[PDB]
Structure 1
Amino acid sequence: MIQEQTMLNVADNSGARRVMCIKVLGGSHRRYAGVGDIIKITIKEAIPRGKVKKGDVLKAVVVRTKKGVRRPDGSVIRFDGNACVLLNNNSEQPIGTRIFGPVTRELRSEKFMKIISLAPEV
């Protein structure tokens, strides 16, 4: 499950492709991540003109997990791989202009309505 050194995919365009977890970012003696949860991230695979540098340390929000979400009743819902969206370290919100897949409706519930306000359908 998502912890120290875990590699995640980027669900947004032209910033980065693959990025690494360094904190689950929730206080002391903490574990795991879920939909709409913040994570402390490092850039490991960059884009030739992308506006986030290789080896730099930033924040992201998680949008897909293979362990999935158990909050619904009866159905346990899992998602494609382990994917996140990059966050602006000085102006808040996501930095991408396009985001892949339809995503969950739970991404509105705190700070991340920008994600479903773009091309996603749920």
Structure 2
Amino acid sequence: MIQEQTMLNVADNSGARRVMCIKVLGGSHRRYAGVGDIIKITIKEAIPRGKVKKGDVLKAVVVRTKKGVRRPDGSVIRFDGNACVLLNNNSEQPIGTRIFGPVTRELRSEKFMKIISLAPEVL
């Protein structure tokens, strides 16, 4: 349950460590982004030598949230800290070659298949 100003950790090796959501895409007055939803992010913290720089404006897919995801039987899956995977402005494909930590069954699309394959565990 991510909104404008929300600070997300990075679940990839892009070099970005802390990113801030500056928009929820895909609707007028859209409040929140859950697991799977694409957000617009600015990079607040990054490693010195990386694929992305501090202050860069790009897209990210939210892959873990504290609010978590609900399954059809009523079950819920909650994580400790919100994390996202950085995507391009044009293509919306991952920058990184390695995703860190687990992901959910909500990324099982035709759009985030790289973020499933490179995942150690899919909860």
SS at match of 2:76: coil
Deviation at 1:31, TM superposition (A): 1.0
Aligned residues: 122
Q: CA deviation at 1:110?
A: 4.3
CA contact (8 A) 1:44 1:55 kept: yes
Q: Aligned equivalents of 1:14 and 1:96: distance in 2?
A: 5
Root mean square deviation of aligned Cα: 1.6
- Structure 1 counterpart SS, 2:116: helix
Gaps of 5+ in 1: none
Distance 1:115 1:32 in 2: 21
TM-score (norm 1): 0.90
Greater Cα shift, 97-106 or 60-69: 97-106
As a proportion of its length, which structure holds more strand?
Answer: 2
Q: 2:10 touches 2:85 (CA, 8 Å); kept in 1? A: yes
Residues 79-118 of structure 1: pairs in structure 2 closer than 5 A: 79-118=79-118
Aligned residues with identical type, % of pairs: 100
- CA shift, 1:119, in A, is 4.1
Conserved in 1, the CA contact under 8 Å of 2:2 and 2:34?
A: no
Which deviates more from structure 2 when the two are superposed, residues 55-64 or residues 66-75?
66-75
> Which stretches of structure 1, 4 residues or more, deviate above 3 A after TM superposition?
none
Contact 1:14–1:47, Cα closer than 8 Å, also in 2: no
1:14 is displaced (CA, Å) by 4.2
Query: In structure 2, what is the Cα distance between the partners aligned to 1:25 and 1:90?
Result: 14
SS of equivalent to 1:115 = helix
TM-superposed deviation, 1:41? 0.3
Q: Is the 8 A contact 2:14 2:86 kept in 1?
A: no
Secondary structure of residue in 1 paired with 2:106: helix
For the Cα contact (< 8 Å) 2:14–2:52, is it kept in 1? no
Question: Does the CA contact (< 8 Å) of 1:59 and 1:86 recur in 2?
Answer: yes
What 5-or-longer segments of structure 2 have no aligned partner?
none
Higher helix share: 1
Cα distance in 2, alignment partners of residues 14 and 5 from structure 1: 21
SS at 1:105's partner residue? Answer: coil
Shift of the alpha carbon at 1:72? 2.7
